[PDB]
Amino acid sequence: TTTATRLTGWGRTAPSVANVLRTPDAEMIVKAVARVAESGRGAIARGLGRSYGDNAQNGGGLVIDMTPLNTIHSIDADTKLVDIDAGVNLDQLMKAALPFGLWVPVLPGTRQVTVGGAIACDIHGKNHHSAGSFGNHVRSMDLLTADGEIRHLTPTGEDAELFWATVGGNGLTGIIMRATIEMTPTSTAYFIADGDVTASLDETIALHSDGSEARYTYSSAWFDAISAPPKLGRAAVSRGRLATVEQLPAKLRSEPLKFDLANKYTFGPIGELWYRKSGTYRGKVQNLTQFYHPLDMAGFLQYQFVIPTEAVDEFKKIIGVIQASGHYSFLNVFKLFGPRNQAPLSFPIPGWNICVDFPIKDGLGKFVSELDRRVLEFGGRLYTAKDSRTTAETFHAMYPRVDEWISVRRKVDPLRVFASDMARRLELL
Ligand SMILES: Cc1cc2nc3c(=O)[nH]c(=O)nc-3n(C[C@H](O)[C@H](O)[C@H](O)COP(=O)(O)OP(=O)(O)OC[C@H]3O[C@@H](n4cnc5c(N)ncnc54)[C@H](O)[C@@H]3O)c2cc1C
Ligand SMILES: O=c1nc(N2CCCCC2)sc2c(NO)cc(C(F)(F)F)cc12
């Protein structure tokens, strides 16, 4: 079913109309690409549309919806390998793999993302400093390339260059049809978590520098970006690891792999004490929602960037520029990222990662451009999955291996068959 449809990112801006093919037939998808390879607005895959930007739309072009390709082919507990269609979402995968004592190795902050989208944006999670990003756990993928052929890529094979170009490649090397992922063994669906509350930016940084991070596989913090210094950058830090069966309480040991406001006090000293109490704890047993999606149970601009580890002073500065700006962000996530991977367009690098969420109002666009500049000057970068407004020139300087990447893309799609709004804006075409 080919249908002219109006598509936007999760942020619901920069709308664009395209011919949306939605089919469960992989043979239909190979033909639509062959067709597009004849006649020149190109094609692009789309997952669940959870990316905020314009990387999954192609104005006046073809957009292939991959979510009907959602078959899990096999799960093997001994090898820890799952073999799945690209349109399988990580929530679906999570529930399918638990009974085998397997855990999805990298989870983002929403489980409604496809494997293809997980690979194409090379997503990260609370465990990046211990496990890397999603691409590090893919052992193979089958990629529908511009020549109508389906190539079988692996991280260390002869096609390693193309594999790593596809990881974080935002769909611009072809369609990931199928992949094999190595899962993390687990005896439990639960976490054991430690909580800590800091009073300032310099404490937060101290906590993340003292060596405690190495004792936790998962870590992230809620972060104050409004309150002026000294309060600026105080945080609720939440850290932990998957629980073993031995560490669960009686009630949960029979089904260990299961899954199924303001008052007058709030802003005074009693609230400060209460919040400090609630956010301080040791060895709390917690399920996925409680630990990983604590938010559970349009008109905003999402902005995420990472600054190199060494440039700690420069990070403090950027955070100060944000609270002084008049633009207030209430929901902020902070994390120290670990080592990077071989993918040239992969976002994560070791250093200070922060996500902020600004209300759309007058002055924002021009303030965010100036932020881009500070982020660039300080050796950091923005995340494509959260962006629709940065310039090609900024992007290119932020990702110095883009040229290396462009070369790989030139060989595999010399006719520019795969294209998107983002590719044209960021001049990756
Ligand atoms: C509330 C929320 C929280 C989030 N938290 C995080 C987080 O913690 N960490 C993180 O890293 N990201 C996070 N994200 C971003 C999200 O993980 C990525 O945007 C992800 O790529 C979206 O997956 P999707 O399946 O919706 O892909 P879409 O948004 O539909 O597409 C995204 C990109 O993947 C490509 N693509 C999709 N399918 C295929 C395929 N089969 N073959 C080739 N290319 C394909 C598209 O062409 C496009 O370039 C979050 C997003 C939201 C809305
Ligand atoms: O857990 C997360 N939840 C998020 N969302 C749900 C709550 C509301 C806003 C979106 S965003 C996010 C980001 N930024 O993208 C980074 C990290 C990380 F650094 F990996 F720890 C975690 C999250």
Author numbering: 7 to 45, 48 to 268, 283 to 319, 330 to 461
Paper quotes:
DprE1 is the first of two enzymes that catalyze the conversion of decaprenylphosphoryl-β-D-ribose (DPR) to decaprenylphosphoryl-β-D-arabinose (DPA). In its natural context, DprE1 catalyzes the oxidation of the 2′ hydroxyl group of DPR to give the ketone decaprenylphosphoryl-2-keto-β-D-erythropentofuranose (DPX), with flavin adenine dinucleotide (FAD) acting as the oxidant in the reaction. We obtained co-crystal structures of Mtb-DprE1 with BTZ compounds 1, 2, 9, and 12 and BOZ compound 5.
Compounds 1 and 8 are the two-electron reduced forms of 7 and 12, respectively, also referred to as nitroso. We were interested to compare the kinetics of inactivation of DprE1 by 1 and 8, which do not require activation, relative to the BTZ counterparts, 7 and 12, that require reductive activation. We used the nitroso-BTZ (1) and hydroxylamino-BTZ (2) as positive controls, which demonstrated that a +343 Da species is detected by mass spectrometry and therefore any trace of this species, if it occurred with 11, would have been observed.
